[PDB]
Amino acid sequence: GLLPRVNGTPPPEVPLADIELGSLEFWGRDDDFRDGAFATLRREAPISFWPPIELAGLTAGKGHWALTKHDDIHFASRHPEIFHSSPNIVIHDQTPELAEYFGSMIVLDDPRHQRLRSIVSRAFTPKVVARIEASVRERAHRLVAAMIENHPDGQADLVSELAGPLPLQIICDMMGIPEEDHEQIFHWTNVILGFGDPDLTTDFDEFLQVSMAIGGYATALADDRRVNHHGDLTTSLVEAEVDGERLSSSEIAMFFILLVVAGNETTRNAISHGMLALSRYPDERAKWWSDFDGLAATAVEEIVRWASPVVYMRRTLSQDVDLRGTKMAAGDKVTLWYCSANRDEEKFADPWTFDVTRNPNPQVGFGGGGAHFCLGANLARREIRVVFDELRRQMPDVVATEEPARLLSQFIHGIKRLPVAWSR
Numbered sequence: 515g516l517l518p519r520v521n522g523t524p525p526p527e528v529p530l531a532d533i534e535l536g537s538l539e540f541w542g543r544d545d546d547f548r549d550g551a552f553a554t555l556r557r558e559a560p561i562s563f564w565p566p567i568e569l570a571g572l573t574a575g576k577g578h579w580a581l582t583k584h585d586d587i588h589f590a591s592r593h594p595e596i597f598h599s600s601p602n603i604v605i606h607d608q609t610p611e612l613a614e615y616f617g618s619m620i621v622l623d624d625p626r627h628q629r630l631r632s633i634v635s636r637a638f639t640p641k642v643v644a645r646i647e648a649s650v651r652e653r654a655h656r657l658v659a660a661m662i663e664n665h666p667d668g669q670a671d672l673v674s675e676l677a678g679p680l681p682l683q684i685i686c687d688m689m690g691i692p693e694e695d696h697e698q699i700f701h702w703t704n705v706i707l708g709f710g711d712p713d714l715t716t717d718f719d720e721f722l723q724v725s726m727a728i729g730g731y732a733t734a735l736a737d738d739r740r741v742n743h744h745g746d747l748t749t750s751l752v753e754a755e756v757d758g759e760r761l762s763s764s765e766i767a768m769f770f771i772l773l774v775v776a777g778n779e780t781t782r783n784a785i786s787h788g789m790l791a792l793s794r795y796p797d798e799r800a801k802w803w804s805d806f807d808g809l810a811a812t813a814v815e816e817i818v819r820w821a822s823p824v825v826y827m828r829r830t831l832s833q834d835v836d837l838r839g840t841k842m843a844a845g846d847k848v849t850l851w852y853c854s855a856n857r858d859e860e861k862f863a864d865p866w867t868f869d870v871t872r873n874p875n876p877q878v879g880f881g882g883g884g885a886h887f888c889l890g891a892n893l894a895r896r897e898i899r900v901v902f903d904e905l906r907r908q909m910p911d912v913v914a915t916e917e918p919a920r921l922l923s924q925f926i927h928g929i930k931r932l933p934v935a936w937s938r
């Protein structure tokens with residue numbers, strides 16, 4: 515069952531000597547240990563250097579400076595000329611020749627970044643956006659209704675039945691991907707997302723083959739829309755133009771590959787962590803369920819602060835930096851620990867309280883601001899609002915019944931399984 519926890523309980527005090535950000539065992543510990551570790555770093559070692567996680571037998575790469583304070587993360591995000599996103603935003607890129615293939619605009623600095631982001635942004639036309647909005651509601655409604663039809667027992671895993679499929683179905687709908695191709699897209703996406711996680715033991719050759727197959731699918735989808743225009747994002751991406759520059763089909767494919775990761779597992783984990791928090795703190799569910807539209811904006815923003823689905827993003831210094839008196843050298847890696855910034859005692863009153871009315875809420879779960887600020891933030895907020903709306907309408911007493919099975923990850927605050935139950 516759910517471990518009892520009172521809303522507002524701080525994490526345990528974790529001694530500095532017990533914190534090993536380069537240790538896989540550390541990332542396997544519960545959230546209360548992790549949160550207490552970052553609280554210790556914020557108080558005692560707010561900028562500190564760490565080795566990467568080393569998987570024995572594979573190259574590890576160089577270490578990184580951990581920024582744990584909201585102010586430092588915000589500063590780094592606002593200075594992309596010093597804190598570069600190229601070559602990649604993870605601590606150690608396992609496939610650096612494919613950094614742009616999987617990363618699209620997220621691994622680019624200006625001027626390349628602004629050009630690609632500007633063209634992609636222009637493709638989100640009013641008609642495309644209106645279809646996306648209808649899709650969010652339709653998909654969330656259908657998935658919750660199917661959970662009821664498929665489980666007369668009133669019990670299901672929220673991840674497989676709802677939080678997992680919703681964000682990827684929305685991405686498929688916006689790309690104009692036929693219903694008949696969903697199973698293939700889901701399979702390829704799952705293999706890609708599953709590679710950095712052990713269990714099932716994900717084979718690199720299979721990972722490379724599926725990565726090329728989904729890329730080839732997307733290039734062919736884009737080429738089809740060059741000939742046959744439709745009212746989807748794929749067609750608007752082929753037609754968009756900034757300063758005479760348009761996107762090639764392989765640029766569109768790389769942006770699609772970014773989406774099925776960045777727009778997908780993040781939202782999934784915001785949903786699962788939101789359902790978990792609403793189950794642990796039933797007063798907050800009651801408040802939201804009593805004034806759903808009125809509290810939606812603050813409730814969703816609190817779910818994102820609480821979940822921080824993206825644990826960190828990595829930058830690389832283009833020049834020496836001295837901040838908080840800590841000297842970091844050009845070429846060093848720097849990590850922005852949003853999970854920590856979203857608990858910074860200097861910015862949030864009562865940071866350990868999950869409060870669906872929280873205002874202000876300067877949360878940085880979509881990043882600290884600036885050039886790379888999540889392109890889909892308002893879409894993510896809509897997905898979260900709409901899915902909880904559909905749960906409230908169709909199964910208002912739905913509740914998590916067990917502690918989640920946690921993903922072992924430094925980068926994603928992941929829930930692999932979340933049992934829930936509901937009545938009429």
Ligand code: HEM
Nearest residue numbers: 619620776777780781784824880881886887888889890894
């Ligand atoms: C709760 C869900 C989500 C979270 C927590 C999240 C978080 C993030 C973060 C932390 C970044 C990097 C920001 C930075 O470096 O300053 C980012 C970038 C991005 N996200 Fe999201 N994201 C979410 C959902 C989405 C969705 C739904 C989409 C679209 C389907 C999306 C598309 C993108 C793109 C395209 C970028 C790269 C933007 C750039 O590099 O200019 N994300 N997101």
Ligand SMILES: CC(C)=CCC/C(C)=C/CC/C(C)=C/CO
Nearest residue numbers: 604607608609616775776780824
């Ligand atoms: C989670 C967000 C916001 C973006 C994802 C970018 C990402 C997962 C890069 C992974 C780098 C890598 C080793 C890719 C091989 O798939």
